[PDB]
Amino acid sequence: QSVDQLIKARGKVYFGVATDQNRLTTGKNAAIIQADFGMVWPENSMKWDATEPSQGNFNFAGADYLVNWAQQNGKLIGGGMLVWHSQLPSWVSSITDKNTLTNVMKNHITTLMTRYKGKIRAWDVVGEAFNEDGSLRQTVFLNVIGEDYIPIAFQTARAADPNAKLYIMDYNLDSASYPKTQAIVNRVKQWRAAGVPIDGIGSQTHLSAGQGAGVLQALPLLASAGTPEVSILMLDVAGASPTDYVNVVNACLNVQSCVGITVFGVADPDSWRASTTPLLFDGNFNPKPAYNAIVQDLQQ
Amino acid sequence: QSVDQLIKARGKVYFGVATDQNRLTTGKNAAIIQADFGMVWPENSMKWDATEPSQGNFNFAGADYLVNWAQQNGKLIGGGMLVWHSQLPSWVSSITDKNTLTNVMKNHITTLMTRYKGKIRAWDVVGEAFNEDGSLRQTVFLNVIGEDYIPIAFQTARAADPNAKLYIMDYNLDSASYPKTQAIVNRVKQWRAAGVPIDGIGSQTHLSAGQGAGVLQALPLLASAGTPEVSILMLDVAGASPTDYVNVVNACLNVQSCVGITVFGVADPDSWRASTTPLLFDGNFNPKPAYNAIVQDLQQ
């Protein structure tokens, strides 16, 4: 039974999953995504070291495959990250000239978004821009361009595909009392009041056992930044307890601006932290109790 | 225990496995490969749709990753397929001029091989070139260029990297009485007598329960073509019976020119036919009975 259908029935946009070409051609991933999920997200195939490994040499084969598969099968598509310090090729982090890096950043955004113009529901334009204390992370982009790199990236992205929702993304936004959570709210409010086109906050939710409950307060706080959308992104939960997963889903239902949830893979052995069996299907592609508890929660 | 260490002790070159970047960053695949396998073969990253999706414009991000991982961890590397009708961009298959397709084919081979010159033990230069009845498969290469496309491919390959072993590969070479088995032997003997540098036949061994016994007669028949090497490539066996797998390993051991065996993935859920559970590790990354039977067989 399909959690995407059930969550749409509750007024949300999607229940989604990260995937890529070799997932869709192995295992039972393609069948499960067709039946049970409404949106796909590139596991790796749109990050910077995958898509522009040297200057101007774009690698689009993998993303092309995912985009075509999604369209053929009637699924929504997300993408990102456009601007991110991890998985950043050395040729970008070596740049010290402000104008050069500004144009490199603008060209990377514009080329990716233009290739799939109109087909991508939402992009994470900037990711992991905050330190844990809430100050801005001192990446090459902050150090060289300055604080306006975030305004410039969103402005550039809006011009490239005016139809896409533009998100800022970060992790460790799972507790309301955490400084990072409050800082991103305060900065996003101030950017949007200055005209920066930030449509969404995406919360990359990687939880330990028992941390689902805290998202019931954190997600409302993120929503108070006033963005039209917020999302739960790349969700997984060590142990995959029903309680944790149901708490996260209910946080999504409780927050009007929360458009949906994306889990970080289908089956446990294909997780980046597989020994914590943190996903909704087991190594035999059977649904786990957490999957069934979500169905039951969404039916009510 | 490492099947690769054990097969090396019986005088063979490797026990290998197919993999790629997102396998190495998820599950337990990297740790099992480090401990137990001696060679890696790209699941997808070196095929034509991934490496030359528009004419003359090459994508190497995924393949570079695999080659660097392998070098860092002391593993042999295989590559392919260079010339293959599947996963073939439509810009190639719509060429109708013989000289243009020949140059396109030569440019694809030379670029890939030159980039990793000296780092790749063996290349599958041509794949799946035969029909089941033993005639040559009518691909764009055969139709536009003619049967000379296979000599041209290998000659070009030998010039691009003289240190690499050059292989032709095909499937359903698993029975000594099947027409396709004798047919590839016939043609390889004739090509080699004409000076075509075919160093190896790679037998893409995808078996159903009970077919391992036939490989004991088929692989020596393949070896009668006189190539320096033969190999078992992309091995998997529906049901993963110890008896089938041991029979395949013993065929390798019995054939002087068989240099090793490559299995088509690490764990069952990541197989292209996962429902047949055809690999040596299960969905929790535990070694299966077939793995332990291979260990015992290699120690006898």
Author numbering:
A (entry chain B), B (entry chain A): 4 to 303
From the paper:
HG3.17 was evolved from HG3, a higher-activity mutant (S265T) of the in silico design HG2 that was engineered post-design to reduce the active-site conformational heterogeneity observed by molecular dynamics analysis of HG25. Over an evolutionary trajectory that yielded the HG3.3b, HG3.7, and HG3.14 intermediates, a total of 17 mutations were introduced into HG3 to produce HG3.17, resulting in a catalytic efficiency increase of approximately three orders of magnitude.
In all enzymes except for HG3.17, the unbound state is never pre-organized for catalysis as both Trp44 and Met237 adopt conformations that would prevent productive binding of 6NT. Use of our HG3 crystal structures with or without 6NT as the design template causes similar, but less severe, structural, and energetic effects. The better predictive ability of the HG3-derived ensembles prepared using crystallographic restraints likely results from their lower deviation from the HG4 crystal structure (≈0.4 Å), which we previously showed to be necessary for an ensemble to represent a physically valid model of the target protein fold. We expect that the structures reported here, especially those of HG4 and HG3, will be helpful to benchmark these future enzyme design protocols.
